[PDB]
Amino acid sequence: EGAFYTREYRNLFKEFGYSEAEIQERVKDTWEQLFGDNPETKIYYEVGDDLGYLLDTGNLDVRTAGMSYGMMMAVQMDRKDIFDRIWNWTMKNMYMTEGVHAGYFAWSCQPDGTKNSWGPAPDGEEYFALALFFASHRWGDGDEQPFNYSEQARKLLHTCVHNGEGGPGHPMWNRDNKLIKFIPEVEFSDPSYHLPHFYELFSLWANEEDRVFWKEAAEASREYLKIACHPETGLAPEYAYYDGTPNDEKGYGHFFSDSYRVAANIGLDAEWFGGSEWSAEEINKIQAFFADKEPEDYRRYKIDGEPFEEKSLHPVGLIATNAMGSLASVDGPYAKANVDLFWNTPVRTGNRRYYDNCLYLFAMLALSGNFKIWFP
Ligand SMILES: O[C@@H]1[C@@H](O)[C@H](O[C@@H]2CO[C@@H](O)[C@H](O)[C@H]2O)OC[C@H]1O
Numbered sequence: 018e019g020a021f022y023t024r025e026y027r028n029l030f031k032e033f034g035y036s037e038a039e040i041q042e043r044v045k046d047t048w049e050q051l052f053g054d055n056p057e058t059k060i061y062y063e064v065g066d067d068l069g070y071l072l073d074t075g076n077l078d079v080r081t082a083g084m085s086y087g088m089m090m091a092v093q094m095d096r097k098d099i100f101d102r103i104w105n106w107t108m109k110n111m112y113m114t115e116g117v118h119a120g121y122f123a124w125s126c127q128p129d130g131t132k133n134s135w136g137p138a139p140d141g142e143e144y145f146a147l148a149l150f151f152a153s154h155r156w157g158d159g160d161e162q163p164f165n166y167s168e169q170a171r172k173l174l175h176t177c178v179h180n181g182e183g184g185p186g187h188p189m190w191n192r193d194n195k196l197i198k199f200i201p202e203v204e205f206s207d208p209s210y211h212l213p214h215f216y217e218l219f220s221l222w223a224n225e226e227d228r229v230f231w232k233e234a235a236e237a238s239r240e241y242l243k244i245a246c247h248p249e250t251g252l253a254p255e256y257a258y259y260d261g262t263p264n265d266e267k268g269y270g271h272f273f274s275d276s277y278r279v280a281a282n283i284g285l286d287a288e289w290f291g292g293s294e295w296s297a298e299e300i301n302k303i304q305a306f307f308a309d310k311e312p313e314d315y316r317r318y319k320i321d322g323e324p325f326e327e328k329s330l331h332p333v334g335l336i337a338t339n340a341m342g343s344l345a346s347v348d349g350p351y352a353k354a355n356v357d358l359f360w361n362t363p364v365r366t367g368n369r370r371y372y373d374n375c376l377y378l379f380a381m382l383a384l385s386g387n388f389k390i391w392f393p
Pocket residue numbers: 080081082124136137138139140141200
């Protein structure tokens with residue numbers, strides 16, 4: 018049974034032989050390298066006394082996926098000061114009140130707050146919502162907007178499900194198949210965006226009128242991942258049609274950056290809501306695929322395993338996600354090896370560090386039993 022039921026989180030690092038003291042130190046150090054004043058590794062920057070943001074170092078912009086990740090990291094680390102700085106920046110510069118996507122958050126902004134687009138990114142919205150629910154549960158709702166956390170979360174999820182009903186807007190989930198979309202105006206998805214474990218919680222905390230829907234979305238996403246992951250390699254494409262096959266119209270039909278999160282998501286869902294034969298086998302497939310491959314040689318791969326000459330742009334992130342996936346197959350043949358590889362991998366430096374480091378901290382929290390569900 019998952020932690021949702023037992024309220025006990027597996028410390029896989031400890032189960033694999035690492036000492037409690039060294040694990041505590043490593044988690045704290047990872048956080049400090051990302052959120053502290055460590056120039057070469059940091060991804061979080063503070064502005065004034067009430068603002069802050071996470072910088073996509075590779076694209077030199079601020080993204081909702083990153084900001085929502087930051088809020089989730091902050092609430093897991095019990096750092097309301099950082100959570101509020103990020104959420105404040107998000108509401109001030111990213112929330113849209115005009116255009117067809119009013120009610121959603123502009124997905125990319127410049128560091129000064131200027132919006133680079135008026136289009137949103139569903140994976141950002143879903144993380145904002147759960148992070149907000151967790152904030153409400155750990156610290157209680159604030160007296161002034163936008164710090165009335167739980168209300169903000171329910172409001173956002175209302176839009177995600179009902180936008181378009183009486184307006185030109187579009188929902189972020191297809192109402193018929195209950196699957197999250199890549200973006201509001203298209204009819205295809207992105208495997209890495211599927212968070213059934215998040216939807217399970219939304220079915221308990223979202224507006225009551227949508228709780229049944231969220232339970233159905235959780236089930237739909239679990240079934241979707243089964244048809245999206247290659248049967249032999251376990252690799253999932255970045256973008257995929259609702260039928261599960263890759264959408265490579267613009268080059269996103271292979272195993273690359275977005276895809277890495279699938280293994281991590283499967284690992285967290287297993288830890289929170291229980292393991293499954295499919296999940297264990299899926300993680301075993303992915304880890305088996307990388308068992309004989311060196312990180313320095315990781316490439317972009319077709320989901321069937323065929324390698325491209327192009328190297329992985331975020332190999333550290335790949336390592337982190339594969340290790341986090343071990344939570345779904347603790348007795349897997351490569352589970353220990355993956356966790357050890359991750360432990361032996363330093364936080365990334367350089368201009369492409371942002372994505373790797375976000376995945377790195379999530380894996381550090383999950384593998385140490387610190388990526389928890391915060392109940393009311
Ligand atoms: O085309 C845009 C997408 O690229 C964008 O998706 C983001 C890309 O970076 C990923 O790391 C994020 O997870 C994802 O949100 O969404 C908006 C869309 O217009």
